[PDB]
Structure formats: structure tokens, C-alpha cells
Amino acid sequence: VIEFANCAWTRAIGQGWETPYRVRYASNLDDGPWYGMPLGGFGAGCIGRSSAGDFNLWHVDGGEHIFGTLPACQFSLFEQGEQTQAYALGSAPKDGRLSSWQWYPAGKGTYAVRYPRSWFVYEGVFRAQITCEQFSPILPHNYQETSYPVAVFLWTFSNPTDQSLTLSLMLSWQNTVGWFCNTTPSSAIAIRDDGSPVYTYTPRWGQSDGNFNELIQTESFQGWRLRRMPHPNPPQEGDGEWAALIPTGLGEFFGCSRWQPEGDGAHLWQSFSVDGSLPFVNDPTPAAAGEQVAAAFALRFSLAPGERKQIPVVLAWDFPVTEFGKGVIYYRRYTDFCDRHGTNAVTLAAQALAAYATWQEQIRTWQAPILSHPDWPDWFKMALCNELYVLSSGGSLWSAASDRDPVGQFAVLECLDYRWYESLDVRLYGSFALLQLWPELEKSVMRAFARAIPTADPTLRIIGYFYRGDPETAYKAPRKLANAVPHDLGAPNEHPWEKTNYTAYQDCNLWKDLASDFVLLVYRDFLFTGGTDLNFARECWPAVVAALDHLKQFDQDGDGLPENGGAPDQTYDDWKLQGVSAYCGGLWLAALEAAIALGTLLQQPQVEIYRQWLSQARPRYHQLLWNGEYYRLDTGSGSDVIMADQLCGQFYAQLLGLVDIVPPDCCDRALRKIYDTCFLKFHNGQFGAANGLLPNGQPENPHATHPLEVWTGINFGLAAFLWQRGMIDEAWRLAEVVVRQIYENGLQFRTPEAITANGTFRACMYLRPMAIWALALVSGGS
Ligand SMILES: [Ca+2]
Secondary structure, eight states: OOTTGGGSEEEETTOOOSSOOEESSTTSOOOOSOOOOEESOTTSOEEEEOTTSOEEEEEOSTTOOEEOOOTTSEEEEEEESSSEEEEESSOOOTTOTTTTOOBOOTTSEEEEEETTEEEEEEOSSSSSEEEEEEEOOOOTTOSSGGGOOEEEEEEEEEOOSSSOEEEEEEEEEEOOTTOSSOSSTTOOOEEOTTSOEEOOOOOOTTOOTTEEEEEEEOSSEEEEEEEESSOOSSOOTTOOEEEEEEESSSSEEEEEEEEOTTSOOHHHHHHHHHHSOOOOBOOOOOOOTTOOOEEEEEEEEEEOTTOEEEEEEEEEEEOOEEEOSTTOEEEBGGGGGSOSSSOOHHHHHHHHHHHHHHHHHHHHHHHHHHHTOTTSOHHHHHHHHHGGGHHHHTTOEEBOOOSSSTTOOEEOBSOSSSOOBOOHHHHHHHTHHHHHHOHHHHHHHHHHHHHHTTOOEEEEEEOGGGOOSOTTTSOEEEEEOTTOOOSOSOOTTSOTTTSOOOOOSSOGGGOSSHHHHHHHHHHHHHHTTTSOOHHHHHHHHHHHHHHHHHHHTTOSSSSSOOOBOSSOOSSSTTSOOOBSBHHHHHHHHHHHHHHHHHHHHHTOTTHHHHHHHHHHHHHHHHHHHBOSSSBOSBSSSOOOOEETTTTHHHHHHHHTTOOOSSOHHHHHHHHHHHIIIIITTSGGGTSOOBSEEOTTSOOSSTTOSGGGSEEHHHHHHHHHHHHHTTOHHHHHHHHHHHHHHHHHTTOTTSOOSEEOSSSEEESSSOSGGGGHHHHHHHHOOO
């Protein structure tokens, strides 16, 4: 019943890792390797469940992260034939809660994922063949269901034995209404040891006062709903409800609305483990001070020899408010298809029960071109889908529609350690999936950038690179200069979209890549959506002009080329560049080309000056940086290092149908050398491409950080570049190594920025790795 297991990530249920990757700095996040596929739409709030069956990831509070199991949130199975057996389908709690429950033995089945579908196939315990397919309706080109806070658990049971079986399927859940909010919002900003600003998150975990549960029973569906008394109007962050439903007509329904998840769970288990029933309870008493509450239902059915039954179970959660900074209130996009009152969980669940099979068909339909591609390896089909997981679990925001944002505004975090949105340098590579599958969301993000470019915040704030532990004497720079390009679209502790350039490790008002990134993204988004959206192009054009003028001020000598200087001033933000760099110089030339193309289409007056700049700048870049084998890092440092991502501009120019920014023979020779050195002489091509090595495969400096890291998303960009330049075998080999490192070593559903050669990672749950879609785009004909 797992469809195309070979294009799915699989692991035996509850099989762990001998030696997973671990975080390279102790102050940074490492929950360990037990992430499974997240459930829930983008910006819906999401929950994750591990390959052991534990619901351990709670992202119901928009942009916030909690990792921890609530053992009572779980499916349990009872079967009786020859023998009687009953198991909760998670791991045994370590702290002794639910001591009466028995837990499914590890290694007795397969967990499989191709996002947004996953499967538990249970085998070798029960006599029935039992599969649970878990999915949310994540649909490309669909700006409705993709936002929904629903998970479908589609169970298939079949009896392969000579004897009739009695089965019962239970879902219990703890009422967490009111838990998912910050009691310390707009808190003091601390500088962490890696230089990043951090805030304090103090959720109301375990605060259940007023929480109650009721059974739901109609002609069509039955289950439970988890609420809180009172429910204010309007709701505040944390206010809402859960529901879970099955259709009627499928067997005998046992409901128990109120049981104690902190106790031994015997009230439930003494019935369930014996005959698959529960004691009848419909008790909406609000929970007392100090008291936790949970609900459960079980469905009991018989399965005759050779019979197959399916049971759809749907969970829905209606938490409509995302509050960011204190008093900064947005509604979630799904509210446009119900309302903003936070009283809709049953109606959402009901819609799911009605539509789940349609949604399942639609998922098979959009994935079918990928799975049937004749020139894509199995691992790639798998990773292409699986890397979409971050669009759900990356602190994703998707707001309610407005006139100027007709499908809502959208944002994914750079990551959990680096808690701000849609970092521009990062999305250069990381935004290829969003462009291809949700181009209206892609456009809203770029429109948010466009609007922010002219704004300013003169307020002086600490720059982390320079911080020496005293706030008052610390070097500070203006939050944002008018017409500078912001690094990001703000943070979940402030105001996403509207308050930009939140990052403070460097002063991004000085960065030399961001302006080019902005232009290249605008043009790419216009071109790859048919070259017809003149509204998008006209809206972004003033910002294109402002961006390029901003970056042109950093051309000190007037040769046409902006020069790096000072603190690290581009995406490799622990790596100092001096003078014209290959990286930023390249992006600049590709940007100018892009602005010339778009500006000509739009008939704009700036086109003449961009052609003059490019006529000076383009020959000059080769003239300055060619060393005979590759492009020099920069003009000022005298470094002999090979930067793997030196010709990012040439990748982009060609991707965009624009003229080569360098001689294609030089491009090809540079790229061959990057591959032969940065990949093949970095521990023999075991990890992928290091960002910078000497021509002999040694580090320039054995202690440097960025040069000696493999950036997953940079590697995917490089693969795409290789493929576009005709080095096909090379692209597939490099991309394979990176996928294997992630999906074999405990990084699945938390893909990081960086791996080292020493079993360590940096910045789990990272935006860049969606760059695997750039390879799909260049190789995908069709
Ligand atoms: Ca919040």
C-alpha cells in the first residue's frame, strides 16, 4: 500500500541512529534525529510525528518551536482473533505516565515519507495487515487547501488469515487549547555567542484551566472537540479548538470525552485492551486549577477472512490568530475559507472527511510527473518532495487575503536558530520550489521586499559581529537605510513583512549581494510565470531602480563594479571580501542584464545607464579576476582560494536566458576546477562541495568556518549549474552525495544549512536546501 516505496524515505518504525549528525555549537538547536513528516498546511500551524510514532513537534504558535511528546496524543490498536493484543502506536514514556498502556514493539513495520504523504506499515505483531497513511492537502497552484490545519489519517485494514478478526482503532488527544502563546512577547533581545539576536519564548505549556472536551455525533460523522471556557471574541493567540472525526456507518463508536493524561491511563486501557471498547463519557466539565484533560474515541469493527476496510480519521485545529510582537495581530489564511472566530474545527474536519479522497487523487496527480520522469534517479524524486517539508515546519506564515495581497502574504523562516523570514540571499537558491509550485506566494514575498526597499528605520541597533558584551558601549548601526535592500522580512517576535532587516549579526545595509539578489529574483519570477504578469513587474520596477543605485554607490573607483570591504558583506557572512569579488561582481553583472531585459520590456528610462554600466563592468570583471584556471575570490585580498559559488551570476544569467557574464570556456574551466577541488579533493567527495579550498585541496586557514562547511543549498545550486553547463553525470553525483548525507545521518525533516567533515551540522531546518528544485527546473524539460 506504500506507493513507490523506492521514491520515499523509509526507516523501520522506532529504529534510531547509532551516530546521527550533531550541532556544531552547543548554544544552537539540536532536538536529535527523531523528526518525521510535519502535518498541517503552510501557515496553518503544524504538528510533526516521529518515525517512532510520537507527536513531538508543536508549531501551532506561528513562528515558534516546541519539541516534546504528549504521550496521550496517539493512535492505539486492539485486535482479537486467536489471541488478544492492544498497543499504543508510539514509544513508552520515559517519565512513567500512562504506565498501564502497552507500546508497539520497535522494528515491527516501516515508516515511509514522500511529502506530503507518509505511511506507517505495521507488520509482524497483529494478524491483520494495517497501514496508516498520513497526509495534508498540500497542492501546487492551490491557495486554499494548502493553508488548511488538517491531517488525514487514512487507515487500511485487511485480513489475510483463515479466521475472522475483531479490531478497534482508538485516537486519544490531550486538550492543549490556550498553551500555544508567548507569556513574554516583545522581550529584551539578547546577543547569542554566535552573534545572532534571540528573544524569550515562554509558552503556557501544561496550563489547561477551563479546558473541556465534548463528543460530536451527527448522522454523517462522530468524534470529539477540545475547547476552553470561556472562548473570547475576538480570539487571542492560543484560543481555538481541536476536533477529530470519523464517518458514521463503519462500526461501533465508543466515546470518552474526559480522561486524565497524567495518570496511568487505566480507565481507558482496561476496556480497550480487553474488548476494544471505551467507558462512555460525555463530560464537558472545565478543567480545574492544576488539572490536565484529554479525550478519546474508538471504532470497533470485524474483518472477515480476506476482507479489506478503510477508515479515514481527520484531525483539525482552529487557532486563527498569529500574534508576533505585542499587539501585532494577523489571521491565518485558512480563516478565509471559514471565519476568524476560532469555532470551526468540526466544520474543517467535516470538509476533510468529504474531500480526503479527492485530495489524495490530487497529490498523486501533481507528483506523477516527478515519479515517472525517465531521467531522474529514485533518490532525487524522493528528495524533491521531501525538501518541501520546511514550507510547513519552517515557522511558516500565511495570512488572510487583503486587496493588495489577494491570496495572503507568505513567509518561511531562514531557520529556527536564525529566526527571521525569507532571507533574500538565502532565497536566491532556496525559493525555486515556491516559484514552481506556488508562484502567487513567491510573488507576494517579492512584493513585500519591493515595498520595504524605500522604507527606513534610523534607530541604532547593536551589530553582533562587533558586540563585546556591553549593550551601551557596543557598536550600533541604523536598522534600515532608505533604498537599501533588507536582508529579511522581519521576525515572529516583532512584525513580519512590515518591519524588515531584523537580522543584526552584520549590518545588511552594507551587503553587496542583496540588491542583485532582489533584481534577479524579480526577473526570474516574472519570466518563469510566462512573462505576462506586468502588474508584478511594474510594482517591482521602482524597487529594482532603487536597489541598483544603492549597490552602485559601492563602486569606489568608477570602473562599473561594486567593491566588497569592511565586515563580511554578503551571504558567506563569516568570510571577508576586499575589492570586486567573483561572487558579488557576478551577481551584479547578471542583475544588470536582468534589469536591462525587464526595463526594455517596460520601456523604462534607466535602461540606457544600465547598458553603459554593463558595457564597462562586464569586460572588466574577467580582466580583473581571471587567473588562468578559475575566478579569483576578489581583487584585494590576494587569496588563492577557489570559491565554489564564484560563478553564481553565470548560473543565473543563463538560467534567465541572458548573455553570458563571462567567456563560456572560462566558465566551464572554472566549474571543472571547482568540482575537481571543492568536491573531489574534500575528503574524496564524501560530503559534497566545500565552499572554499586551495587548488591542492587544502584549507587556506585550517580553522576557518564557512570555507570548510558543505552548504546543502549551495551544493544544489552548483548541481543545477553543472547540469546546465552539460556536466550531467557530475551534477547527479554531487547532488546524490548531499541527499545521502541528509537522509542517512539523522537530518530528515530538519535539513541544515551546513555539514562539516566531522559528523556536525549548523542551522537545522533551513530554507536554502529547497535549492534542489533548481536542479529539477534545469533538467525537467516537460
Ligand atoms: Ca506568536
